[PDB]
DNA sequence: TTTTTTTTTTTT
């Protein structure tokens, strides 16, 4: 074995015997720019220098001569090959080999090497494994001419992955199995990092593992750097080596030599090396003496004889240029062409983009993608060039490319209909030799012809991939023999499960990241503004990779829209930069006289004077670039329309065209129904053709918009589509918008891939002129659908949306289709940066839409009183038919629509065609109305002269100003909607007139006031509804009366009691049938919502109410501990539940209500401070939002029986939003519903009222509203007549076997729910023995009577609160006393760090039975309570101040609020499954509040205020505390009733002396003045003698003990 | 033969 050096030291230690073996096959692989052709020129030159011959098989096609020379590379004796079939490149090596005249020979790229079949053959055509199998016989023939001459040969390797692999490297190398199996080394490159001066990148960090060894021991590894230009820094390497092996020494920074200084710093002893060539010899051949494990390393004449025959060999069999030294190819020097930029021709490094090879630019939407390459056009068409623009995309606007300098008339143009046609086309025009840059519009639009062909949802894994990989392999070699430049350009995606460097990438796999001789990251950094307008997109550009110069140098420049980019504003930046143009303050010169004050006067002088800027570029290109260059046309032509020819006549007629006469390139506008907003698009309305999205938050208007959009379209003849998907269309609500409800085809498709697949049958017809899709957030993949909820499917939504666009794009575009997705907001979790708020669906979207809208309510438009419309604000966010960034506002008027005549008027004032003087409004001297609104109606009332108007605005503010047939189109359109039918089901799509399913049909709230304010006379079934408010506003109330109602009417009903607090006995007071009512009280919020989804699927439930959605607690966080994060786990539930929730229930016609608790957004001091829970999904899918709060007490006297009550109606999608309705709940009764129809019925004039006399027609039915109520409750059949009444008065949109088969499914549903979840998971109310209410005494008589139930409920949260030493403590030691006394097990949390055990004892507590906690941490204390109620060990647990539960971080805003609301939502359920109360004791800080946030006061069932009111005196000391307890919350009887009582100190509460008041209030005990007397007999003077006395006789004590509590209790 | 692509707030 002899060995040859590989140009890196420590490469050749790691391969044992160092160097790579002469006579055998050697594999270099790694990623792109990852140093594979730089360390092959390393070894050639290494070879050269010690006088051996070496061959470079370029079949990459991407050989730089002049940096081959920069690496040592003797250039003029470099045998060069770029063969033109990979058999071919193979048959060199063979001859070569043969010859015995070569002793290394490299093969750039195997993958590279294309077989001759596949040459000849089309782009995606199959050849299974072609070079697979030329590989293997190549190595067969290779091998044994290898040896026996003595000859290396090297093969680099490319990297792709191997598909459907999912257990293991995923790598994979290109070419076979042979490869591996012959190579006598194999190494893997990588690049791990970069070199630094300070700023510049002027190296890569590389690292080779030898992953292959048949000479020495595998698996060693070479650390070293490959600088620029420079090559492996070979003396860096020396530097550690020698400091290593302590042959250099190294104090500190200081390395020496044998005693002498030689420099501070790696940097300074490699440049000593360097300069001292002889010394660094004998260092390195000591190194290598040290490390090296084997010693390894006439004439002439007959070599040059077999050489040069040899070469005559190849060139006489394979033609003229087949091999040659490099030095003296012409058709390898690298020439450039101008990217537009100046600032990027510098950072190229070789003056702009190099001919003959493959460029990418990549990054986000409106970058500049598109700009950026028109502008290369423009300059190469200026320097008389061809070029050809492959728009993929479909989104290219012609007058735009004018407006850039782009000669249209001249630029081919071609809208391919799949990627193989693209790439086809493009090989074609290479092979012409006709064209001299061809751009490709995005490779992710490059869709192949089994995709296009096959249906959304069908997977092609990696398909585009591999046609992407077969092309490079065949378009290299013919760009390069053409000299032409391909440019593709690129979207990003993100790489789903990387937290770890970048998650973005690219489209189309691997392939074109190492075929590009530049890649180009672009990015918007920020807007050009002329005070208000944003008239252009400040812009960077990152040269990513470079093969012509040094890489990672940066441009930055101006976009100006409409203009291009501000080259002469780059050359006054630059020129000043280099000192050539002078700047005094603001004023610039050069040499000597004043051109400009200021940046822009300076550059439009540079625009001035051509000459001088050319002068002032040129000085700046000698300056700042670091690699400088330096009959015939009509056979061009008939090569060209020979090639133009072939091209028609493969692919169709229009396939290839000059872009300036391609009449189907124009782009054309539909109306949005604003005008405003027509204007703000800049072309006068929505293109068609395109792809449009519309997003903003809940209630923006985003349906409505749509749907004028649609109105105006039908009002021109229009065809439309509905895709509702969010299943919440108002067909009626639609009409009134001016919709043609009987034309609008409209579906509400089942999975989000049948929502796409009709999307496509209706564009591909081309007999549909706009379809919308109703919420791509409501597109749900059929694989989400059929799984579980909680089930993960990490973007499947986005790869589907992706899969779509490139489907759809080129459908639309050749039937001028417009399709407009509406989407939802969601938030980015850990975003503190900029902007928070996403879109659903993933990233192609953005990419793919020509249009983007945000629209959002700014405020409410009103009648005095009323609100009657939303004031309403869009931003056009994103425009490739005009500049973005214009906002158009309107105002939407409820049931009429956007108020198109309103911005007329506003506009024709602004534009003073409209006169304005005060409040009257003048048309051409003639007054048209007095105020906006009759202006308005005016216009609206003379349509001809509002046209004239509208008109006139139009040419004034437009910048992008516009311009058997239908018989086909029916046959289309009838045949599609029978596919579409046959595929996907009967009633899958319909005209929306005839669509009985879609009416909508309500069912009463229980208040007759909510139903007039609801506006259609109740909830919508089929729909979901929410209601939130405060703690005991009447959420749980309001929604047991809807269920009564519902029952009452033979509706089956459901209620998920989440918040584990429903009371079953109350629930019956409501009217509720406790016996048929189905109840569950779920684990967790994933199980809660799947059984939603499961009685919803079943068809036999009518409405399921979700108690407390802030209560559905992810499975995850139940089983986590306290204080573990699961930031948004529960947002992110919920928005899947509403995506599978939303059809369900439709299709089953079921209401479906979530109730929803407050909490506070922290640091918000404008507005509402106020959010709900569970995320922003339920916001968006609700049909109704309610906001219901107590606005006081209804009274008898002295008594509270009841709750005054608000309601306002804060979103509403079946009638108008914003009313309110008021009524009471009265307690243990409910909403009083006749009192409201009494109030109703007197403010309709229905019922007479002369004085507090209330009479019906004529007869008098009562005096004072209370006897009225009393009357129509008596007289049901009138009360029904009086309610018919008042609702036709006042409701705005009024609405309009059998049961053996629902007990069945309903029974079935029930046995599976309770298979999947467990036995008593779901059941009917009534026999649920579980949910019972249990109480434990307080120790106190009078608090015990207090609270209506006799004690504190088991199982349940209770809080007390009060000021500071109000007997909180006592209290609760009373209770636990109490407890014991029964045989109770209790535990006490002492977070406060101050119970008193002794203190304890005295008031009566088992002090040695008594568990007792003084925790650390919040966390701990809340962990150890959940720990004791998961146990059911323990009956009563106190926790003493959440005051005191400080967060584990604080002991190292609200974070104790985020904790406690966690707390309470793990707590809930596992105290009620193990009847364990618990206590929680608050301090105060109405000014007063609560510790620890807002959680506590939602899920406590009693809420105590204790306060010391006075003190007990023995004469002198103070001997007690008086003390008062309001019941402040009650949950388990009736609110607001209040106790009294003393604690005496060192004994606790005074028991005995409640009994005596108590006694004496019920007249048990008598007093006379001041004696008190039991049955006769006198029992003592004064409180304190009385209440000793009972305090003597227990049993008589029992007995008024015992009769008290049958009172009172 | 050879990757595909984000999800979504928490709470005085
Ligand atoms: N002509 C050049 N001028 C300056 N730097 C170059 C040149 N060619 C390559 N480089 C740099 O050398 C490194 C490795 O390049 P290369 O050996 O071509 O990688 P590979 O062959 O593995 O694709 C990359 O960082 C690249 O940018
Ligand atoms: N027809 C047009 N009129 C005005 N501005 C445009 C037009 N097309 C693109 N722009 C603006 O130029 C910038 C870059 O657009 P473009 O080059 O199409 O980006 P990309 O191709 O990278 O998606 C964006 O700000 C965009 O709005
Ligand atoms: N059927 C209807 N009757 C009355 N007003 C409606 C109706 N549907 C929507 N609106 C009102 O119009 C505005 C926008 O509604 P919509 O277009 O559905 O919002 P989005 O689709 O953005 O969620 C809201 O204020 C809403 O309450
Ligand atoms: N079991 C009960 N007995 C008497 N009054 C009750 C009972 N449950 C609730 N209430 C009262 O009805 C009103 C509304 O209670 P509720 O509907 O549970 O409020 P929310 O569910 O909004 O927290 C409150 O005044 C409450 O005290
Ligand atoms: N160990 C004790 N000895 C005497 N008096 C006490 C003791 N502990 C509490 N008290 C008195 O009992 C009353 C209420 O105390 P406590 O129940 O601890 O109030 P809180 O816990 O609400 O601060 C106060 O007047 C206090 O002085
Ligand atoms: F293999 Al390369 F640029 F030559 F990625
Ligand atoms: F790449 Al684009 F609009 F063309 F984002
Ligand atoms: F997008 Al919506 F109600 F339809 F907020
Ligand atoms: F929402 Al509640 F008591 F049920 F405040
Ligand atoms: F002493 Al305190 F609440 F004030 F226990
Ligand atoms: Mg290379
Ligand atoms: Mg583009
Ligand atoms: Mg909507
Ligand atoms: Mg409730
Ligand atoms: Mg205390």
Not at 689 to 707: A, D, M, N
Request: hydrophobic share 40%; with cysteine.
């Amino acid at each position: 074995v002899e060995t040859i050096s590989t140009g890196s030291l420590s490469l050749d230690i790691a391969l044992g015997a160092g160097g790579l073996p002469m006579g055998r096959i050697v594999e270099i692989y790694g990623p792109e720019s990852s140093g594979k052709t730089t360390l092959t020129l390393q070894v050639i030159a290494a070879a050269q220098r010690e006088g051996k011959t070496c061959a470079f098989i370029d079949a990459e096609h991407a050989l730089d001569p002049i940096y081959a020379r920069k690496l040592g590379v003797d250039i003029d004796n470099l045998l060069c090959s770029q063969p033109d079939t990979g058999e071919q490149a193979l048959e060199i090596c063979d001859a070569l080999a043969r010859s015995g005249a070569v002793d290394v020979i490299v093969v750039d790229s195997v993958a590279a090497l294309t077989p001759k079949a596949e040459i000849e053959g089309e782009i995606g055509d199959s050849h299974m494994g072609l070079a697979a199998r030329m590989m293997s016989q190549a190595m067969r023939k290779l091998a044994g001419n290898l040896k026996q001459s003595n000859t290396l040969l090297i093969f680099i390797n490319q990297i792709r992955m191997k598909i459907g692999v999912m257990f293991g490297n995923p790598e994979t190398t290109t070419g076979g199995n042979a490869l591996k199996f012959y190579a006598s080394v194999r190494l893997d490159i990588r690049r791990i990092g970069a070199v630094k001066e300070g700023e510049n990148v002027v190296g890569s960090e590389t690292r080779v593992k030898v992953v292959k060894n048949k000479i020495a021991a595998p698996f060693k590894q070479a650390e070293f750097q490959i600088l620029y230009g420079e090559g492996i820094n070979f003396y860096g390497e020396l530097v550690d080596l020698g400091v290593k092996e302590k042959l250099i020494e190294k104090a500190g920074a200081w390395y020496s030599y044998k005693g002498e200084k030689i420099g501070q710093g790696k940097a300074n002893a490699t440049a000593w090396l360097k300069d001292n060539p002889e010394t660094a010899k004998e260092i390195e051949k000591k190194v290598r003496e040290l490390l090296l494990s084997n010693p390894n390393s006439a004439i002439d004449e007959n070599k040059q004889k077999a050489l040069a025959a040899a070469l005559g060999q190849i060139e006489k069999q394979f033609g003229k240029g087949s091999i040659m030294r490099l030095g003296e190819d012409r058709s390898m020097d690298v020439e450039t062409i101008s990217t537009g930029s100046l600032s990027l021709d510098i950072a190229l490094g070789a003056g702009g983009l190099p001919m003959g090879r493959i460029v990418e630019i990549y990054g986000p939407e409106s970058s500049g993608k598109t700009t950026l390459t028109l502008q290369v056009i423009a300059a190469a068409q200026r320097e008389g060039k061809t070029c050809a623009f492959i728009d993929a995309e479909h989104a290219l606007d012609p007058i735009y490319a004018r407006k850039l300098g782009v000669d249209i008339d001249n630029l081919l143009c071609s809208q391919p209909d799949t990627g193989e046609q693209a790439l086809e086309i493009c090989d074609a025009l290479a092979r012409s030799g006709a064209v001299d840059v061809i751009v490709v519009d995005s490779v992710a639009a490059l869709t192949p012809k089994a995709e296009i062909e096959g249906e959304i949802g069908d997977s092609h894994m990696g398909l585009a991939a591999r046609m992407m990989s077969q092309a490079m392999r065949k378009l290299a070699g013919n760009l390069k023999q053409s000299n032409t430049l391909l440019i593709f350009i690129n979207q990003i995606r993100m790489k789903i499960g990387v937290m770890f460097g970048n998650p973005e990438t690219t489209t189309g796999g691997n392939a074109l990241k190492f075929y590009a001789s530049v890649r180009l990251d672009i990015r918007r950094i920020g807007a050009v503004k002329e005070g208000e307008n944003v008239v252009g997109s400040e812009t960077r550009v990152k040269v990513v990779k470079n093969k012509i110069a040094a890489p990672f140098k940066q441009a930055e420049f101006q976009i100006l829209y409409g203009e291009g980019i501000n080259f002469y504003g780059e050359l006054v930046d630059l020129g000043v930069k280099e000192k050539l143009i002078e700047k005094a303050g603001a004023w610039y010169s050069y040499k000597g006289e004043k051109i400009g004050q200021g940046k822009a006067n300076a550059t439009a002088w540079l625009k001035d004077n051509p000459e001088t800027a050319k002068e002032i570029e040129k000085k700046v290109r000698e300056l700042l670039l670091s690699n400088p260059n330096s009959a015939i046309d009509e056979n061009k032509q008939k090569a060209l329309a020979a090639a133009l020819g072939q091209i028609e006549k493969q692919f169709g007629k229009g396939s290839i065209m000059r872009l300036g006469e391609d009449r189907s390139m124009d782009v054309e506008t539909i109306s949005t129904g604003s005008l405003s907003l027509d204007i703000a698009l800049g072309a006068g309305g929505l293109p068609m053709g395109r792809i449009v999205e519309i997003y903003g938050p809940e209630s923006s208007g985003k349906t409505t918009l749509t749907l004028q959009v649609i109105a105006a379209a039908q009002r021109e003849g229009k065809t439309c589509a509905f895709i509702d998907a969010e299943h919440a269309l108002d067909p009626i609500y639609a009409r009134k918008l001016g919709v043609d409800i009987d034309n609008l085809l409209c579906s509400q498709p089942d999975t989000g891939e049948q929502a796409l697949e009709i999307c496509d049958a209706l564009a591909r017809s081309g007999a549909v002129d706009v379809i919308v899709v109703d919420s791509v957030a409501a597109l749900t993949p059929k694989a989400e659908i059929e799984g579980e909820i909680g089930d993960s499917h990490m973007g499947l939504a986005a790869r589907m949306m992706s899969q779509a666009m490139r489907k759809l794009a080129g459908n639309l575009k050749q039937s001028n289709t417009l399709l407009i997705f509406i989407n939802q907001i969601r938030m980015k979790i850990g975003v503190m940066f900029g902007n928070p708020e996403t879109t659903t669906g993933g990233n192609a979207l953005k990419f793919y839409a020509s249009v983007r809208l945000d629209i959002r309510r700014i405020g409410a438009v009103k009648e005095g009183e009323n609100v009657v419309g939303s004031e309403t604000r869009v931003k056009v966010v994103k425009n490739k038919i005009a500049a973005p960034f214009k906002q158009a506002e309107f105002q939407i008027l409820y049931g009429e629509g956007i108020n198109f005549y309103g911005e007329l008027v506003d506009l024709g004032v602004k534009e003073k065609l409209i006169e304005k003087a005060g409040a009257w409004y003048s048309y051409k001297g003639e007054k048209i109305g007095q105020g906006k609104a009759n202006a308005t109606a005016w216009l609206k009332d003379n349509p001809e002269t509002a046209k004239e108007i509208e008109k006139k605005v139009r040419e004034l503010l437009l910048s992008n100003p516009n311009s058997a047939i239908d018989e086909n189109k029916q046959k289309a359109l009838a045949a599609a909607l029978g596919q579409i039918e046959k595929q996907f089901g009967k009633g899958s799509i319909m005209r929306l007139g005839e669509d009985r399913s879609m009416d909508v049909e309500t069912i009463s709230t229980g208040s007759l006031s909510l139903d007039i304010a609801l506006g259609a006379g109740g909830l919508p079934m089929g729909r979901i509804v929410e209601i939130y408010g405060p703690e005991s506003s009447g959420k749980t109330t309001l929604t047991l009366q809807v269920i009564a109602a519902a029952q009452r009417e033979g509706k089956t009903c459901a209620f998920i009691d989440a918040e584990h607090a429903l009371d079953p006995i109350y629930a019956r007071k409501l009217g509720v049938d406790i016996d048929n009512l189905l109840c569950s009280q779920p684990d967790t919020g994933e199980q809660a919502l799947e059984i939603c989804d499961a009685l919803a699927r079943s068809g036999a439930v009518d409405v399921i109410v979700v108690d407390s959605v802030a209560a559905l607690t992810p499975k995850a966080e139940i089983e986590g501990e306290i204080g573990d994060s699961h930031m948004g786990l529960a947002a992110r539930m919920m928005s899947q539940a509403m995506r599978k929730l939303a059809g369900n229930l439709k299709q089953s016609n079921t209401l479906l209500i979530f109730i929803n608790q407050i909490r506070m957004k922290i640091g918000v001091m404008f507005g509402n401070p106020e959010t709900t829970t569970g995320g922003n999904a339920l916001k968006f899918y609700a049909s109704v939002r309610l906001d219901i709060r107590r606005i006081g007490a209804v009274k008898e006297g002295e008594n509270v029986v009841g709750s005054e009550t608000r309601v306002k109606v804060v979103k509403n999608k079946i009638a108008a939003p914003f009313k309110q309705a008021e009524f009471q709940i009265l307690y243990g009764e409910g909403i009083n519903f006749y009192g409201e129809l009494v109030d109703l019925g007197v403010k309709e004039k229905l019922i007479e009222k002369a004085g507090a006399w209330y009479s019906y027609k004529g007869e008098k039915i009562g005096q004072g509203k209370a006897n009225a109520t009393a009357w129509l409750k008596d007289n049901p059949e009138t009360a029904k007549e009086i309610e018919k009444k008042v609702r036709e008065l006042l409701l705005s949109n009024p609405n309009s076997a059998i049961d053996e088969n629902k007990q069945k499914a309903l029974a079935a549903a029930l046995g599976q729910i309770e298979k999947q979840f467990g036995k008593g998971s779901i059941m009917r109310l009534g026999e649920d023995r579980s949910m019972d209410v249990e109480t434990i005494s307080t120790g106190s008589l009078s608090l015990d009577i207090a609270l209506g139930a006799g004690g504190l409920p088991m199982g349940r949260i209770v809080e007390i609160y009060g000021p500071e030493s109000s007997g909180k403590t006592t209290l609760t030691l009373q209770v636990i006393a109490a407890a014991q006394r029964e045989g109770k097990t209790c535990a006490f949390i002492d977070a406060e760090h101050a119970l008193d055990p002794i203190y304890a004892r005295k008031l009566g507590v088992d002090i040695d039975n008594l568990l007792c906690s003084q925790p650390d941490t919040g966390e701990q204390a809340l962990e150890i309570c959940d720990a004791l109620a998961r146990s059911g060990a323990v009956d009563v647990i106190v926790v003493d101040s959440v005051a005191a539960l400080t967060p584990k971080a604080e002991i190292e805003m609200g974070l104790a609020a985020r904790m406690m609301s966690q707390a309470m939502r793990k707590l809930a359920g596992n105290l009620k499954q193990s009847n364990t109360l618990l206590i929680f004791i608050n301090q105060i800080r109405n000014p007063e509040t609560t510790t620890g946030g807002n959680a506590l006061k939602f899920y406590a069932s009693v809420r105590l205020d204790i306060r010391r009111i006075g003190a007990v005196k023995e004469g002198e000391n103070v001997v007690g505390s008086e003390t008062r307890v309001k019941v402040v919350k009650n949950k388990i009887a009736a609110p607001f009733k209040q106790a009294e009582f003393q604690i005496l100190y060192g004994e606790g509460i005074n028991f005995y002396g409640e009994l005596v008041d108590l006694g004496v209030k019920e007249k048990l005990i008598e007093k006379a003045g001041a004696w008190y007397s039991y049955k006769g007999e006198k029992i003592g003077q004064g409180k304190a003698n009385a209440t000793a006395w009972l305090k003597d006789n227990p049993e008589t004590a029992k007995e008024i003990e015992k009769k008290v509590r049958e009172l009172l209790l």
